[PDB]
Write a protein that binds this ligand. Structure first.
Ligand SMILES: [Mg+2]
Length: 335
């Protein structure tokens, strides 16, 4: 069925399923629609014979150069997507709710790529975008398919971040702290401003645009201090670097960062160490450091993130598209 966002009780059940699901994703939580307040929310779900929710999908509709909308369920749906018969059922509900207004329904779940899975999806009528598309550009995928994920369940005895790494890396992580760097965290307006100052500075230094502060304020208003947390690194009164991490489902996700120009005393390493500590203290299964463009020392994102994740980067299935309007799809989507 389709979720009535005006029914507190219905909404409560939807959230309770999302928050308790091992497949939960913050970008599938109802709070995400509040962050993306410029998009239109349309959410659906399936129930079992007991009337209990077994699958859900939070979609957001965006405008395009055409009379059709772009329906996107970021990192959804919430369920075991390899169970394609169930997926088809959930999708059919989504399709019904979209009511012909969208030219496509796209979802990019965090499930490993495999020829077997890719083939099944294609056999079921879906159009997939992964190893067959451009690694970048407006034709690339919305979310990076390659991601540096730290699997903490491999270290059941880990008490502190250092316990996860070899001596050489322990050295790199100890450096900033040994040099006076200190990190405090929370989710207050004060910490958001601190983040914003480093965020805009880093953006200017990199010649890129930055999201407005209101974006993060909506995020702060949507998620409590146990879900969203900002880490601020400083040295003797000098703001150095920051990072924003979200804890949801089976992982804590390093989503945004900022760092001042000049000498930063490896403050970014300190931020990472504290985010990882938060994962450990909360018994979280995974710490996700985000995407990379390529697994090579030529990728600076890979270089930084490889310090904390020595395992191979995870490669997801990519974008799964349920083509609704063929003509428009071919116009707006190409390899
Ligand atoms: Mg623990």
């Amino acid at each position: 069925p389709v979720l009535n966002l005006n029914d507190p009780q219905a909404v409560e059940r939807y959230e309770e399923f999302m928050r308790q699901s091992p497949y939960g994703q913050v970008t599938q939580d109802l709070g995400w629609a509040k962050v993306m307040n410029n998009w239109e929310p349309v959410d659906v779900y399936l129930e079992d014979d007991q009337g209990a929710i077994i699958a859900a999908m939070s979609m957001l509709l965006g405008d395009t150069p055409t009379d059709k909308k772009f329906a996107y369920a970021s990192k959804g749906p919430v369920m075991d997507v390899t169970d394609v018969d169930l997926l088809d059922r959930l999708v059919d509900e989504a399709v019904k709710a979209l009511d012909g207004r969208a030219y496509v329904l796209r979802f990019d779940p965090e499930v490993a790529y495999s020829d077997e899975f890719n083939t099944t999806l294609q056999d079921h009528g879906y159009v997939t975008r992964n190893r067959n598309v451009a690694d970048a550009g407006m034709h690339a995928t919305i979310q990076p398919r390659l991601n540096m994920v730290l699997d903490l369940t491999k270290f059941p005895d880990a008490k502190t971040t250092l316990d996860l790494y070899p001596s050489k890396t322990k050295s790199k992580i100890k450096r900033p702290f040994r040099d006076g760097v200190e990190v405090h965290s929370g989710n207050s307006a004060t910490e958001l401003d601190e983040f914003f100052k480093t965020y805009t500075t880093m953006a200017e230094r990199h010649g890129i645009t930055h999201r407005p502060i209101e974006y993060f304020q909506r995020m702060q208003a949507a998620f409590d201090a146990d879900t969203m947390r900002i880490f601020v690194a400083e040295r003797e009164g000098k703001l150095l670097s920051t990072g924003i991490a979200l804890k949801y489902g089976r992982k804590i996700w390093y989503m945004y960062a900022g760092s001042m120009d000049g000498n930063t005393y490896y403050a970014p390493y300190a931020v990472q160490s504290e985010m990882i500590q938060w994962a450990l203290d909360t018994n979280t299964d995974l710490y996700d450091l985000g995407g990379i463009e390529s697994e090579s020392t030529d990728d600076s994102l890979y270089v930084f993130k490889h310090v904390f994740v020595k395992d191979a980067p995870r490669e997801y299935i990519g974008e799964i598209d349920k083509v609704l309007d063929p003509e428009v799809y071919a116009e707006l989507v190409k390899d």
